[PDB]
Amino acid sequence: QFMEETERSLHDAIMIVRRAIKNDSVVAGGGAIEMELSKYLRDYSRTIPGKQQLLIGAYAKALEIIPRQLCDN
Amino acid sequence: VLESKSVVPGGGAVEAALSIYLENYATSMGSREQLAIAEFARSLLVIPNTLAVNAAQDSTDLVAKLRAFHNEAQVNPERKNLKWIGLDLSNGKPRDNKQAGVFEPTIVKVKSLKFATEAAITILRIDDLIKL
Structure with a gap:
C-alpha cells in the first residue's frame, strides 16, 4: 500500500518539470506570492475604497487559504 | 475645550487611520498578534458604521472612503x-475641523479604549456559569 504515493512523485515531477520547460518563467511555489498579494491587494483596501476595500480585503485574504490549508492540513 | 487644550481632531477620519495605523503595525508582529492588531483596527469602523x-x-x-485618505497616515485638516x-x-x-469634521478632546479614548479593551476580555475568561 506504500507504492502508489512513490511514483506520483515521478509522475508529478515530469508534469511540472515539463511545466518548468513549457513556461520557463517560474516563481516560488507553495503559495509564496499570495500573502504578499494578500497584502499587495488589500493594500488597495487602503487605496481602492470608496467602498470595496471590503471586496479588496475579502479578495486579498482568500488567496492565503490554499497554502493555509496546506499549512493546516 | 477649556480643560483639554489637546483635543483629538477628526471624528471618523481617525477610525480609518487608527484602522490602518495599526493595520500598518499589524503585519510587523507576524504570527497571531498580527491579528490582534487587525480585528482591533477592524472593530473601529463601527463608529463610522x-x-x-x-x-x-x-x-x-x-468608512471605505475614509481608508482611502492618506499619504502614509494622519488625521489632520x-x-x-x-x-x-x-x-x-x-x-x-x-x-475638516473648522468645517464640519468632528473632534474629540484628548482624554476620552484611553478610557473607552481600555474599557472596551477590558470589556471583551473578562467575560471571555469564564466558561462555567454553573451552580452548586
Missing part, C-alpha cells in the same frame, strides 16, 4: 484629499 447607520447612511461607502480629517453625523464622511 453606526454614524452612517443612525444617519441613514452607509459607511461601506463612507492639512489636505483631506490626501489625508484624513474629521467626519459628519448627517453624512459620516471626513470633513
Whole structure:
C-alpha cells in the first residue's frame, strides 16, 4: 500500500518539470506570492475604497487559504 | 475645550487611520498578534458604521472612503484629499475641523479604549456559569 504515493512523485515531477520547460518563467511555489498579494491587494483596501476595500480585503485574504490549508492540513 | 487644550481632531477620519495605523503595525508582529492588531483596527469602523447607520447612511461607502485618505497616515485638516480629517453625523464622511469634521478632546479614548479593551476580555475568561 506504500507504492502508489512513490511514483506520483515521478509522475508529478515530469508534469511540472515539463511545466518548468513549457513556461520557463517560474516563481516560488507553495503559495509564496499570495500573502504578499494578500497584502499587495488589500493594500488597495487602503487605496481602492470608496467602498470595496471590503471586496479588496475579502479578495486579498482568500488567496492565503490554499497554502493555509496546506499549512493546516 | 477649556480643560483639554489637546483635543483629538477628526471624528471618523481617525477610525480609518487608527484602522490602518495599526493595520500598518499589524503585519510587523507576524504570527497571531498580527491579528490582534487587525480585528482591533477592524472593530473601529463601527463608529463610522453606526454614524452612517443612525444617519441613514452607509459607511461601506463612507468608512471605505475614509481608508482611502492618506499619504502614509494622519488625521489632520492639512489636505483631506490626501489625508484624513474629521467626519459628519448627517453624512459620516471626513470633513475638516473648522468645517464640519468632528473632534474629540484628548482624554476620552484611553478610557473607552481600555474599557472596551477590558470589556471583551473578562467575560471571555469564564466558561462555567454553573451552580452548586
